[PDB]
Amino acid sequence: AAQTNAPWGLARISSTSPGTSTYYYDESAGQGSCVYVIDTGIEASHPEFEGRAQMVKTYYYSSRDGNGHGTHCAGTVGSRTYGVAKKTQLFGVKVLDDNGSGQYSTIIAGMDFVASDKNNRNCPKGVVASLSLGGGYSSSVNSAAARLQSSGVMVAVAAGNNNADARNYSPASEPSVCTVGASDRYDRRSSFSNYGSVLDIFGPGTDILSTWIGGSTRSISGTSMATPHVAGLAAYLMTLGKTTAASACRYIADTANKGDLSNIPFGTVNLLAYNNYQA
Ligand SMILES: [Ca+2]
Ligand SMILES: [Ca+2]
């Protein structure tokens, strides 16, 4: 398959080089995989989700995404136009309030919820969790992300937007999950992207067009935007049977574009998510 004039991030993950415009991807498009978007929720009614998104849990008065952040990330995972895995199933877990903030206890509960809830879903190609959130280092947040990963879910988490070492942020600092930094369309590290040894991979994160609430779209930046690229890529690759939840992060790093990125401090992987698609 080939989406012309795709968002640059989608084009980038299907190219060995920056600057392309077409997103090349296998028609399977993550069909049969499921991605939990643990965030502010998802506006499942967005036409761009084609009925493939649904709220499964909220820790607030409503399951409605009153912010847009979760709807944006979900769209990068699996919306028709802005998504990596255009046929995946999206499950919304609203651990963040409509201001985009969430208590660590609620984020941990949301992670434990996904580890259980996935056992009630038909996800033959496997389960992914996209965590475009984080705060200061927390052993308990890290332990929750580790549990989710151990439960058999491919956990992708944002490195953080502090232009610092992700070692001091959670769940970014949890070694066992897939910690995602952000790059821009010119293959530089996003100016805000955290770095450090705990990063496993980079994904497009600067000026990322995706779904927004009110059935709209908008472009925003963050490791929160790179994370769903990698989550979608994982779902996409799991559907192709190229990898499993336990090995998806390592596989993506092994198959990533190596050395393409600039502004990568010594000790940080220079690896950009890449789907290695060949027509
Ligand atoms: Ca290259
Ligand atoms: Ca890791």
Domain ranges of the chain: 2-272
To the question of whether residue 254 is assigned a binding role by annotation, the answer is no
Q: How many CB atoms within 10 Å of residue 88? A: 32
188 CA to middle of ligand 1, Å? 12
User: Is residue 37 annotated as involved in ligand binding?
Assistant: no
Q: Give the span between the Cα atoms of 103 and 55, in whole angstroms.
A: 19
Residue 104: both structure tokens together: 């660590």
- Alpha-carbon span 209 to 206, nearest angstrom: 9
Q: What is the Å distance from ligand 1's center to 10 Cα?
A: 15
- Of all ligands present, the nearest one to the C-alpha of 199 is 2
Tokens of 137: 């280092």
Using what technique was this structure determined? electron diffraction
Is residue 200 a known part of a binding site? yes
Total number of residues shown for the chain: 279
**Could you tell me if 39 and 73 are in contact, meaning their C-beta atoms sit under 8 angstroms apart?**
yes
Resolution in Å, one decimal place: 1.8
39 carries an active-site annotation:
yes
The residues whose Cβ lies within 5 A of ligand 2, an ion, are: 200
C-alpha of residue 147 to centroid of ligand 2, in Å: 13
Å from CA of 273 to ligand 1 middle: 11
Q: Is 257 helix (H, G, I), strand (E, B) or coil?
A: strand
Q: Which entry of 26, 39, 98, 187 is annotated as an active-site residue? A: 39
Query: Is 182 strand, coil or helix?
Result: strand
Tell me whether strands 135-136 and 169-170 are parallel, antiparallel or unpaired: antiparallel
Backbone dihedral angles phi then psi of residue 208, each to the nearest 5 degrees: -105, 115
- As a whole number of angstroms, the distance between CA 224 and CA 8 comes to 16
Specify the DSSP class assigned to residue 160: -
Ligand 1 mean position, distance from CA 238 (Å): 24
Spatial distance between the Cα atoms of 93 and 98, rounded to a whole number of angstroms: 13
Spell out a b/e string for 109-124, using b for 16 or more CB atoms within 10 Å of the CB, else e. bbbebbbebbeeeebe
Residues whose CB falls within 8 Å of the CB of residue 35, separated by 6 or more in sequence, listed in order: 74, 77, 78, 85, 88, 89, 90, 91, 127, 128, 129, 130, 231, 232, 235
Ligand closest to Cα of 157 equals 2
Q: 112: annotated binding-site residue?
A: no
> How many Å lie between the centroid of ligand 1 and the Cα of residue 181?
17
Q: Is 268 annotated among the ligand-binding residues?
A: no
Q: Which ligand is nearest to the CA of 250?
A: 2
272: left (phi over 0), alpha (psi -120 to 50) or beta: beta
CB 205 within 8 A of CB 225: yes
Q: Which ligand is nearest to the CA of 256?
A: 1
Specify the fold of 2-272. Rossmann fold (3.40.50)
